DNA sequence: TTTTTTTTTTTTTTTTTTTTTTTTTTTTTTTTTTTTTTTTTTTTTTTTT
């Protein structure tokens, strides 16, 4: 299953150091918990290690809850629970996850390469030929992962009486694909995101940074 | 006219500079085209007393 949910309750009473690290830099301190428990893992199950090689934490019961609405600049770049309705979820893509490339002058296997989620990741030179030139994925090679865009908006119970439910873009990644179907209501734990290529810098009009969450734990609320 | 020292002076290169020649080289935007909606202007089947 490749995915351990810790619950912040008792992360917050054993340890409340990280529990208060954890929400401001979501991003390393989840890093950091994924490998600890990936080793904590392998101490346990040595045989496990061919299995996906990576243990997702998930975090459960995050205290406090941004709505939709509510969600600021105040909160980017930090772990946040929201709650809303799925409208829209894509089908599971294959995302690019360790990728080698094909330098097309030599053939050479450019060697892998992490896919951050902020950035498209261009080799430079192959090593071999210190060719620039053209690169290709090579799929073979590559090894994906399961992503999947969903829609959340607010609840429409939710909205109050003059006002429009505000929607949000969360990013599911590889054990949390179709974990959510339109017309769920859902508790979304992720990153408010904001830097991977979202900024109208292109004379559209204002400099507006479009944001997402990297969802991080997905709660059904239902039977 | 036999012996003998400066003299080049042609041949090896080497330096060595100055000049001309040689070698190298994808990515990123934009745009047309196609296929869709969508409001509006008709127009073609519906029925009555
Ligand atoms: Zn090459």
Excluded: W
């Excluded at 428990?37 to 090689?53: C, F, G, Q, S, W």
């Excluded at 030599?106 to 390469?113: D, E, H, K, Q």
């Excluded at 959340?152 to 003059?162: C, L, R």
């Amino acid at each position: 299953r490749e995915s351990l949910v810790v619950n912040y309750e008792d992360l917050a009473a054993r340890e409340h150091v990280l529990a208060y690290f954890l929400p401001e830099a979501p991003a390393e301190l989840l890093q950091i918990f994924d490998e600890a428990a990936l080793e904590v893992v392998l101490a346990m199950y040595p045989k496990y290690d061919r299995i996906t090689n990576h243990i997702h934490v998930r975090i459960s019961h995050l205290p406090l809850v941004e709505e939709l609405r509510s969600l600021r600049q105040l909160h980017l770049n930090q772990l946040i629970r929201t709650s809303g309705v799925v409208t829209s979820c894509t089908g599971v893509l294959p995302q690019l996850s360790m990728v080698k490339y094909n330098c097309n002058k030599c053939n050479f296997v450019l060697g892998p390469f992490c896919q951050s989620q902020n950035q498209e990741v261009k080799p430079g030179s192959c090593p071999e030929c210190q060719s620039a030139g053209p690169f290709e994925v090579n799929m073979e090679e590559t090894i994906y992962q399961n992503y999947q865009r969903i829609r959340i908006q607010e609840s429409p119970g939710k909205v109050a009486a003059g006002r429009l439910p505000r929607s949000k873009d969360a990013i599911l990644l590889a054990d949390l694909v179709d974990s959510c179907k339109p017309g769920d209501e859902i508790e979304l734990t992720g990153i408010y995101h904001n830097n991977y290529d979202g900024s109208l810098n292109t004379a559209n009009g204002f400099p507006v940074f479009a944001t997402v969450i990297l969802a991080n734990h997905v709660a059904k609320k239902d039977n």
